Structures are given as C-alpha cells and as structure tokens.
Amino acid sequence: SSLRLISLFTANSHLGPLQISLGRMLLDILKFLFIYCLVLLAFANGLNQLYFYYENSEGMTCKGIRCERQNNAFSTLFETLQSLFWSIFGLISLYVTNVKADHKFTEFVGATMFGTYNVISLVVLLNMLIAMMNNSYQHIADHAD
Amino acid sequence: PLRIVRAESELSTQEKSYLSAVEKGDYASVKLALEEAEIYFKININCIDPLGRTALLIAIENENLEIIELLLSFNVYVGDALLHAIRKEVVGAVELLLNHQFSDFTPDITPIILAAHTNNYEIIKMLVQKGVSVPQPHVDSLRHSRSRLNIYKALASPSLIALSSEDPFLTAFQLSWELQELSKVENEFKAEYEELSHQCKHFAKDLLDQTRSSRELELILNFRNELARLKLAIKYRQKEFVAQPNCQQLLASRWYDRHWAGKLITCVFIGLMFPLLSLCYLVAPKSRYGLFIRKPFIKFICHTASYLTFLFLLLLASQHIVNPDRQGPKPTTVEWMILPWVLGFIWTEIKQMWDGGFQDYIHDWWNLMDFVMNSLYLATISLKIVAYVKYSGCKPRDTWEMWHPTLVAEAVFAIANIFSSLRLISLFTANSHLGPLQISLGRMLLDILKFLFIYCLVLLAFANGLNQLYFYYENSEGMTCKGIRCERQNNAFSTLFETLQSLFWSIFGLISLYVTNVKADHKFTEFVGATMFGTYNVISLVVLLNMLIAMMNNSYQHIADHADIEWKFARTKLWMSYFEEGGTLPPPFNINVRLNHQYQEVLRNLVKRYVAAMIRDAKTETEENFKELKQDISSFRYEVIGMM
Amino acid sequence: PLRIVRAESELSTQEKSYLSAVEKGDYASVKLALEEAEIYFKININCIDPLGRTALLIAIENENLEIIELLLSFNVYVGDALLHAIRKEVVGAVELLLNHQFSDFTPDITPIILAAHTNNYEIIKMLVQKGVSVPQPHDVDSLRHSRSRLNIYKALASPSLIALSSEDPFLTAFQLSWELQELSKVENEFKAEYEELSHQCKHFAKDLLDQTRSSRELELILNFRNELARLKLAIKYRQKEFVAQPNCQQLLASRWYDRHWAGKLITCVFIGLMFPLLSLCYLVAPKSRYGLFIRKPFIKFICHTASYLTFLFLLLLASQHIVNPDRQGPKPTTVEWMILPWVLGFIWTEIKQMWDGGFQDYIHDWWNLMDFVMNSLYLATISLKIVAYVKYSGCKPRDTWEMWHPTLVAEAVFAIANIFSSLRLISLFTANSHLGPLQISLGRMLLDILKFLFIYCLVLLAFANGLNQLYFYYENSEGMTCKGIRCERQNNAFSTLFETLQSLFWSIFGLISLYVTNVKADHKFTEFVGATMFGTYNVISLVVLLNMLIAMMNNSYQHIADHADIEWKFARTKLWMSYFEEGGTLPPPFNINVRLNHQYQEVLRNLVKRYVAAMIRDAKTETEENFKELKQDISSFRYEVIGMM
Amino acid sequence: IYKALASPSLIALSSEDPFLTAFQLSWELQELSKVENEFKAEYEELSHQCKHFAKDLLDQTRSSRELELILNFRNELARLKLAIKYRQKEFVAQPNCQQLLASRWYDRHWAGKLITCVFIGLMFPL
Amino acid sequence: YQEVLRNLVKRYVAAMIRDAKTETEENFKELKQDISSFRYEVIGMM
C-alpha cells in the first residue's frame, strides 16, 4: 500500500523524469538475475552435499543461522540456500564451516567452496551489473522527455 | 490499392514553356512572353508550380536581378515577395523590391522581424534607414505564444543590438535575464527560451574580446566605485563575461598587488604573525604594515590563519588538562579565548545581514550554515549562563538526570564544532587543483538529493510493515538495555522509532540476524519478518544504491563540460570579497561630464571591430571559393559582350 | 634572428612565365614557347618549380590532355609521371603514358602495386590487359624489407584486384585474411595495420555474398565442395561477418526449426516431459512417425536439455537424509546406480570427441577443459569408492575416523565434482535471444579481470610476508582447543604463512575481527604496527585496487558491446551446427563435379559482376556526382562555340 | 513495398486522412519487426519515421482554433486518446498540445504553492 | 476538418521541398543558371 505512492512521482518536473528512467534500467537487472540464481543453486548443491552428514541437534536451544550462536548453516538445502543469500551482506560468520570432529580436510574444502562463492558473486558478478547498467542509462536518457 | 490524386489540379499546356524560360536563365524568351501578353492573351503571367513557386519566386531562388527587373517592369503581383527575398538572402532583390489566401509565413511576421531572424547587417541596416518599428513585448493561446518568441528572437540578434542600441552591453545583460526568467514560466517552450539566453551571454564575451589595449579594458569595467561594471556583470550571472582571459589577467594583478616549496614556506611565515600585522594596522596604518594587511592576498592569508587558530582552540577544549564533573561550572580558560571568535563571527554576520535586507541572503549553502552555527553557539552560551545561577553544586555525573542544562549545553556545543570545521570547504575554490574538484563535487550533490526522496518512501513503507508485525512481541524482562545499541540487540522492531533506527543501520551491516527472533515457538512470523528484512536489504544496496552511481556518472559528464568558467566565476567572487575596505580585521580583533565621451569612442571602435570580424566569419566560412568562380565567368561574359 | 633561405636555389628569369602559362592552360603560349626545336635560348623544358612540380606534372594535376599531348610530342622527360597519373586516378593520362636523385615514391613501388593501392577498377584492368605480375610475399636493411612486404600485401588485399584476377574470390579472401591476422603477431610494430587490413578482407566476402538475388544462388554458394561444406569452412577461418549474414541466417533458422510467450514455453515443457519415449522409439523403430520426429534439430536440442535437467535433479536428491547412515566403507546407494549411466555416457562422449580432433583446437576452448576436469573428478570418485569398499568394513562412529580417510576424500571430491556439472549449464544461455548477447559479452570482459589478479596477488603476497615476519614470534597453542581464524574466538590469524595468506583474503569481505592483531603481552608498539599494516592492506585492496577494477570494465564494455550481435550469432550458429548431423541423436542416459563447377562459376561470375557494378557505378555520388555535371555543361558550351565559328 | 508505402510524399499525396495512415502503418510496422527477427533493425527504423511524420504534420498549425479541431475530430479529445492507444509519443509530447492540455488541467512561487496545496488538501472532506 | 487538413498538408509539402532543395546544394543551381544564361546570350548574338 505504501509502495504505490511512487506512481504519483510522475507529476513533478523534477522527480518525474527520474522515476521513468529508473523503471527502464530494471529489465536489465531481471536478465542478470538468471545467472546469480544458477550460481547460487550450483554452489548450494555442493555445500549441502558436503555438509549433510554432520547434522547435529544436541544441547542447543535454537537451530539455524538466525541465532546468537549460528550453527547448522549447511545442514539442509533450505538452510543452505538462505545462508548463502545472507552472506552477500556479510551476516554469516566464519565458524559455521566447522564440524564437531577433527576432520580438517573437509572443513578446508567447505571453506574454499564458501570463499569461491563469495568471490564470484561479489567482485565478479555484482561489478558487471553496474557496468551494463551504466552503459544502458546512456541509451535511455536520449529519449526521456 | 490504387493510388490516385486528391485535392489537386493541373497547371496548363502553354505556361510550361513560360515557367521553364525563367528557370533556364533565358531572357529573350521571357521578354517576348510578357510583351505579347499585353492585350489579355490569357497566358496568366502569375502561374503556379508543383512546389508552389510563381514566375517571380523562381527569379529569386536563382538570383537574377535582370529577370527580376524585367518582371517588375510589367504590372505583376508581388504579395509576400519581399519576405521571400529577405529569407532567401538576396540583397539585390530586397533593394529592388523595397523601393518599387495562402502564405508560407505566420501573420505576425514583419520584414524587420524576419530580417533580424536572418541576422544580416546589410538588410537590417537598409530596412532601418527607411524607418521600421518592433512591437513592445509584454484569447488565442497558440498565436500569442508564437508572437512573443518571434519578437524576442528578433530582439536578441547581435546585428540589431550593434546597430540600434545606445549601450549594447547593458541590453545584452538585461535581455539574458528576462529570457532566463521566461523559461521558468513557459514550460512548453523552455529549450527555445534558454538557448536565446545563452546566445546573449556569448555576444557580450565576443564584444569584450575585441579590446586591443589595457586602457580600453580599464575603461569598460570601471564605467559608472572601482570595477563597477564588473560587479554588475555578476548580479546578472554573466559567467562568460567574467571568465575572459583578459579580465582574469587584470583581476590577478589586483589579487597579488617560483616552486611549491618556495611559496608554501612563504605563506606559512606570513600567516605566522598575523596578530603583529593586525596590531600595526590598528595602531598606526601609515607605512609599515597598515597597507601590508590591505593587500588582498595578504588579507586572505591572515584571515585563514585566524580561522585555523580557532579550530585549534576547539581541539584543546577536550584535553583533560583544561576540570571535575560539577553542575553549573565556571567557564574554563580556553572558552574565554573562544568567546571573542564567536562574538566576531556574530558581529560579521549581523553587519552582513542588513546589506541584503534578508533578500538573497539565504540563497547559498554557506550563509545558512553560518546562521545555524551562530544560533547553536548562542544557545550554548544561553544554556551555560542559565545553568550557573540555578543548577549549581557538585554531584557525581552518574546521578545526574538527563535533560540537565549542563548536558544540553555540552551537546549543543559538540554539534556546533562539526559545522565550524566543515566551513573550511569554502576555501578550496582559491586553489587551481582543489578548485574545480569542489565545484563538480557540489553541483552533483543536488543530483543526489533527488534520489533520497525515494529512499525515504521505501524506508517508510518497510518500517510500516515490520513494526505492525513485531509490535505485539515487545518484552523487557530481565533487560538492562532496550534497543539495538547494546551488546545483546533486542526490541529492534518493537516500536516505530526503533524500527526506523534499525532499518538505517542495516545499510552498513551493523544489525545482527538474531534481532528477527521472538521469545516464542512461532516460526512462521519469524520467517516472514526475516523475509521482509531481506527484501528491504535487496532493494536498498543491490538495486537502489546501484542506480545512484549509474546516474552520477552520466550527470558528471555534463557538469565537467563547462567546469572552468564556473570555477573561475566562484574564484572571482571570492577574490573581490577582499578588494574593498571593511572586514579587513581578523575575527579575533575588530571587537559625469568628462567620462562618457571616451567610453562612447571605445564602444564605437569595439562594435566596428566586432562587425568587421563577423562579416568575415560568415562570408568566408568551402563557401569563400564560390564567389571567385562566379566572378571569373562574369568577367568572361562581360569581355565577350564587349568584343561582340 | 636575421634568417636566410638555407639549402635551396633559384629557378630562372624566363621559365617562370612559361610555367605560369602552362598552369593557366594557355595552349598557344606554351606551344610557341616549346617551338624552339633543336635551337633553344637556354630555356629548359625540364625546369622544376620550388615545390618540385614539373611542367609535364603540372598538366597532370589539372588532367588537361591537350598540353599533355603537346609536351609528349616534344619528348619531355617523364621518369615517373605514369606513377603520378596512377596515384591521382586519371584515365586519360594513364592511357597516353602507357604507349609512348629524388623520387617521391618508395623504390620498390611498381605501377601495378600503386594502382591496386588506389583501388581504381579501370587502371588496374588497363594494366592487367598489358601483362604484369606482383612479387609473391614469400634481412639486410630490415627497414625496407618490412615496408616492401607490407606494400605487396596491401595490393593483394584489394577488392578490385581480387575481382578480376582470382580463380575463386570467396577462397582467396578466407586464406589471405587468415594469414594477415597471424602476420600481425610476428611483426608487433605494425600490428595496427596488418589487423586492419585483415578486417577489410572479411567485409569483402560479406559484401560479395550480399549480392545474391534468389535463394537458388545462396544454397549453391554454401554447398560447394556433405552438406553446407563451404559454410563450415568459413567457420574454421573465423569469418564472423560472413556467417552472421541475414540471408544465410534465415536459411539456417529454417533448417533449425524445420505462437506467443505462453504458447511456446508450455509446449516446450510438454515435449520435454516425454524425453525417454521418443528416445526408445528411435532404438526400436526409426519410422517417420516417431523415429524421425527427434531428427529435427530443435527437438533434439530439447531432448538433450531435459535429459540434463533430469541429471541435475537426482544429483540434488543424493544429499537427502531419506536415501547409508554413517557407516565406514559403504556400498553405493540406489541413487548412485542411476547416476552411473549419465557419468558413463559423458565419459564416452568425451572419449569419442578426444580422438576426433587430436587435442588440437579441442582442449584450447574453455568449455572443454572444465568437462575434462569434471570427468576426471568423477573417475577419481568412483576409483576411491571401489578402493575403499574392498579394504574397509565395519560400522564405526563417524567422529572417530582419522582424516585422509578414503571415504571422506571420495565424498569431498564428489561434492567438488558436481559444482562444475551445474555451472556447465550456463553454456545453454547462448540459444536464447535475450540471455545470449548478455552471456557472450559476459565472458569476454572476464578476460580483463584476469589481468588485475596478477597485481592483486603480488600485493597480497607482499603484505602477507611482512605480517608473518612481524607476528610469527608470538604464536601460542596452550589453552586453545580450537586454533585458527575459522573459530568463534579467532586467535592465530598471522602465526604462519598459510594462515596469514588466507586471513588476508577473508578481510576483503569483513569477516576478520579487529582483536586478532593483539598479542598476549604488553607490547603496544608491535601491536600498533601490525594494526597499521593491516589497515594499509585494507585501504589499498578495497578503496584503491578494487575501485579501479570496475573503473575499466565499463570502459572496456563499450568496445565489447559495439559488435556484440555478430559474436552472439557466431556462437549461436556454432551451437546449431552441432545438432544438424547424425550420431548425437541419443541422450547420454540412453547411449552408455563437372557440372557443379559449371553452375558454381556461372553463378559466381554474375555475383562478381553485380558487386563490381554496385562498387563503381554506384559510388561516384558517395556531391562528386554533380561535379562532373558542371564540367559536362562547360564542355558542351565550349564545343558548341568552337564548332559554330 | 513497405519501405515505399511509408514515404511521406506518397502519404501526403494519395491519402484521404494522412493522420490515420501514419498511425495505422506505424503500428503494424512495429509488430512486424518481431516475426521477421532476421531483418528487424530496419523494420524498427521504418516504423520510427512514420511517427515523426505525424508530429511534423501537426506542427504546421497556425492558430489555436484549428488545433482544437484536429484533436477533437470524431466526446472531447477523441483523437488525442486515439494517439495514446497507438503509442505515438511524439504526437502527444508536442509543445502546442501540451500547452492546450495544461490549460484544461489547471483550469505562484515555491512557498506560495505548497502552502495552498496543503490547505486545499486539509479541507477535502467538506 | 478536410479544409484544415488540406492547409496543413500544403504547408508541410512547401516546408519539405524548401528544406530538401535548399539543404551548399543550392549553390550548385546558381552556377548552372548563370552558365545557361551566358550560353543563351552568346547563341542569341551569334
């Protein structure tokens, strides 16, 4: 209800043209969301497959990533898909890659998967979203009045 | 389909030869055609063309004064042929026609208006000599709109201004002012009006470009105290006129009246002993330094060192050398030194207030910032005075009640120190490298302020839906803290104020993920709240903050285009604020008969040079080598006639 | 400065007027001046004006033939006037001069080479009719050896010369453009001119193909020398412009396809649902009803895609808790038995593709090395599983297993393996008109990212060296059950090189806390130094280094996106042509010329004739078309006046 | 055929109502640029030239009396609504018809407009 | 409406021909015209 008040911006000489050009650099973002979703699915399918054999629920008041002491980040597909999403904003801690065992080899592989996902999605994928958005505003503002 | 002809007819079978004779340059045939048609031979010497051109019209397209004279020798209808000749740039046809329902011109067009539209010195002069007038610009909306744009277009032509204006400089200053005002009230015709305003601004610069001496330039800028016409050129916002190389070179000679580490040391040394120069100017301004402080560059340096000393005193107020925690304390030794600076700033602002009469005083950012800072300082002084006579005594600061006057005074003083240190930005326009950067950094700041209208709406929309869901779960049992600003963040969405606070700190990632939890087993409302938080996070940084920089890039391109005239305008405005007398003491202290003839001669010479340059700028610029080719064949034809 | 004219001379007092008369076009004056036959009053007919122009060369500059013939009748010295006439493109001067130390032309320049340079059809044909030969392109004064080689390649790569002296202009343009591209890599000083010469050769083939009038001609050009033989030959030579032509793209799409937004996706899904029906029908009976239906390339593409999405489904279903506890050395489950046919089919396809090319141009592409890594990882997984099954048995708690256990490594490698399997599916974006150009221009700007890694890694190593050298003497391991930065209380960030190298990587994303720079001692000076170096690394990598990685990507996106439709069309046709043949119509789960020359040359002759006609008779206008109109009028006037009297 | 049927000279010479053929042909030349995707960059430009022709034709009005007759041909503003349906953004965003529309819409300074708008909006129930 | 449309089309045609014929390209015509006039005068005298 409160997000429909923006449609009234097309009545001011200043906020009018800006809103029209904003809604035209939005079909470009939709096209770029078919790659991030595939990358997210590909990395979740690996992280969950690696970490699904270490699911524990002993002596914990809560269970999930939305907790004071995060745990079971990659235990299930539902939690893996939404723990990777929250890592774009830096709200997932590093210790969630550990397990209750001395298996140092698997923890390193999981941390490497997490870091590889972080690199691709944040410095390789979100930087070329700006590159094509800036190079499409030029072709949009030519016919904007 | 079967294509046909609609609403048209055929011309003739005999008039085709007559119309082709004037087209192919023949003269004997056209002589015979009109001579034989004397006794009503039904040839209709006023024919028509597929393009709509009569016999007289074609003779003007291909300029042939002999055919035109032969035609006007007989009784032929002229109609709007004078307008056609004026628009077709034929001086001979215009001269011939001057002394002798379907139209392609609007009813409001007069020959003088169209000639001024064409911008030709000879035709405009010829029309003016015979005596013409233009209506004064002040039911039908379409006709009244395209009748004042035509008048203003004809009134802003450089040729007409140079021809029939008593003072072409003033009528170019005022014309650009009226045309720029009219663009605001005339939203449909806004591009047309703003282009004419720019044209009148370049005319003044081009007319000033024809000064061949330093005595002619010192006579134009000093007309009607010192630099009187230069100050008037700024009131009308003539950026091109001010930012002229000769004007800047003349102004730099009054500003100043070497390597970087031969001048930085000199500036530091000069600014080291500003109190000595101030004392010398205050006790005896005869020889030693009573005029040294009067130099604009020395005065600028001394005024900067005084402000830098003031900022250093505000840094020493927080040192623990300069008090216990007692209610209503006496001012420290540092604040006693701070007081004169504040009093001087207040006095300067007061003495500057009445000059503008509260009109255009609050027009720039810096004057409003000064007002806010001065008001905050006055509030600090008032609160410190109040707290001394009523809320006295000594008490531990942990036991004080919030809203205590001694606390509000310190808070208001702390806020005022931020504004006084940010005022140092305005000194960046005096540098060649930091100058243009600051101008481009303040003109795209207004660009940002338009994207902050949508962020407020999005923030309000999401805070409406988060609080509405999370308000019923508020609890404060066993909690010494209540809010997000503590180690265990809680009640993040329990009230509208804290919902607005916690939705702003999430832009920088300072809000943890467990604040979306409740002390219950309701795992469906928790997921919904987390989804709202995530959706707000998505379209605030990935989407909304990405198009903020996408348009910043493409608005910096236009700003940086003309970025050297704006910086020079700002620097000249900063410079001339130190030329005059009054305010030469730092804030720590201080607590026309034989005049018009020369100008008229200079103006006559300048206009003559301008017209001499403008005739060559058009008659020569692959068009100059077109009249020689016609002259060669004309001479050949004349020679052949002479021999034959 | 009292300046003077250095290193010059003066011409004469008499021949200046003769040169002026020659310039003005006065026939009588220059005729009587030259009448000093064998008795001259010290006037040289070979005088040189101060700008180097000669009387014979002056008439060439105005292409006025009367004084040209008059001078030629008196045996004036020519020397190189033919080259000047060729360069200025005057047909009459070349006609007259063809039958009769300082030079402004490079010594190895021959008239044919310069004529081919000017790209004038008439002069080249005129010279060829007499019989000439350009040296073949196939070291002591290397400056003029490279210049001479460049000149003959510029003459060879001219549309006019190719159109009248080539057996097959469609073939001499493919090879010559290929060798021009690879010759720009061995001569790096002239790489900007060799590569711009090859680009004009690719446009020539496209322009020659643009002159087809009917579909009968087009299908005969591309089928020369089983099907679409010449079209595949152009793909081998990387002729993107030739391939991405609308007229041939239409035919290729007609072969590919052999409705609205909601009317196409639904039927695509409907076709893809019964993937294993008309795949077993193919094996049972290849009849027109069902066996030949999958033969359509569009249907075959959908079958291979739905069969791959099915593989990605039960790949996602192998991590479910429903489908062999935590037992040591287990047998494969029921999902892995279904997984095995897909892996076997992929391995068989890679094996049959391996020897088909001999690892030349087969592993050079990025979409084959990833596949090889994927099958290698799958093979390692199955080998580790079968090794662990025969030497390990007994149910044991998982927490008690020692690391490097074969089962653990097997599942880790399997988890790594299927990440690449899902990421390979991004290669199908090139078949869609919306995600096609976006994906093609996505992996092309990615190559510019690889160059910032070479400086990022150097900065990382430089700072890691200093951080380790400072902090390696303070490490401790008592009272710490958990050790490292992947812990609730990070304690040993900069203790070893391996830990320092990865604690600086995690600081890009802000996952390293500020208390990891503290030591268990009252040494404030070293702690401050370590914090300062950590902050300096943060500033350089996040405020400077990564800020200017995006500052060029948009400035390089402009060049990439300029011709972004030709590359996408080339990729799409490369994808299409892999489904046009027989051999791949079996998804991996179910796989475990006497007259021809006559017609071709008779079509090509007409094509070349149309091209040359449109190139000469339709390019004089491209203002210059009306310049000769005034000359025609003046010539008619002159002829009428002269003949009347 | 389409490139010849879109020429302004032929429309201005052999059309009963050129304001309608520039609307109808510009619409069917825009949706035709999708079925023939191979030749689409030239069909789109062909449709674009049929949109500027209408704007140029409507730019020849001399008085406001004839302008109100063009926009009201065939209730009120019957042809302005028809142009919006055909997505003729150039025919609609013309200064003369903008100025006419603004007079119907409205039927002051920065601080003299907001203070009046808020007063009007604060007394809307009555 | 038909009368107004006729006026509009006539004005548009006039503007189109004026803009197309005039737009350097017009400078060619005044050369051909004077050449033809001189030629016709020469033939008339002879």
Ligand SMILES: Cn1c(=O)n(CCCO)c(=O)c2c1nc(Oc1ccc(/N=N/c3ccccc3)c(OC(F)(F)F)c1)n2Cc1ccc(Cl)cc1
């Ligand atoms: C993806 N990732 C990752 O997930 N974690 C988490 C591990 C779990 O704790 C890292 O710690 C890490 C990392 N990436 C790097 O740094 C580079 C830098 C450049 C590279 N390549 N540059 C180029 C340049 C040009 C051409 C080709 C490659 C590169 O790739 C590489 F070297 F192959 F691994 C890795 N680190 C830090 C690190 C590095 C080395 C070591 Cl021995 C230990 C930690």
Ligand SMILES: Cn1c(=O)n(CCCO)c(=O)c2c1nc(Oc1ccc(/N=N/c3ccccc3)c(OC(F)(F)F)c1)n2Cc1ccc(Cl)cc1
């Ligand atoms: C907004 N958000 C969110 O608040 N949380 C927090 C929930 C509680 O913490 C998420 O966890 C989350 C999320 N977004 C995604 O991932 C996508 C990405 C793109 C999508 N669609 N893209 C397009 C692009 C173009 C056209 C159409 C769609 C999409 O589909 C969806 F849901 F419809 F947005 C979901 N996740 C992670 C996640 C995903 C799936 C599942 Cl089952 C669980 C978690």
Ligand SMILES: Cn1c(=O)n(CCCO)c(=O)c2c1nc(Oc1ccc(/N=N/c3ccccc3)c(OC(F)(F)F)c1)n2Cc1ccc(Cl)cc1
């Ligand atoms: C790199 N770094 C850092 O690692 N830590 C961590 C130390 C332990 O936690 C800081 O705290 C820090 C810092 N940088 C600054 O602030 C600047 C910023 C720009 C400067 N100059 N910019 C330019 C730009 C162009 C040309 C010349 C100079 C500059 O001047 C200086 F010192 F020279 F860098 C200082 N601070 C905060 C700080 C400031 C002052 C003080 Cl006394 C203490 C802390």
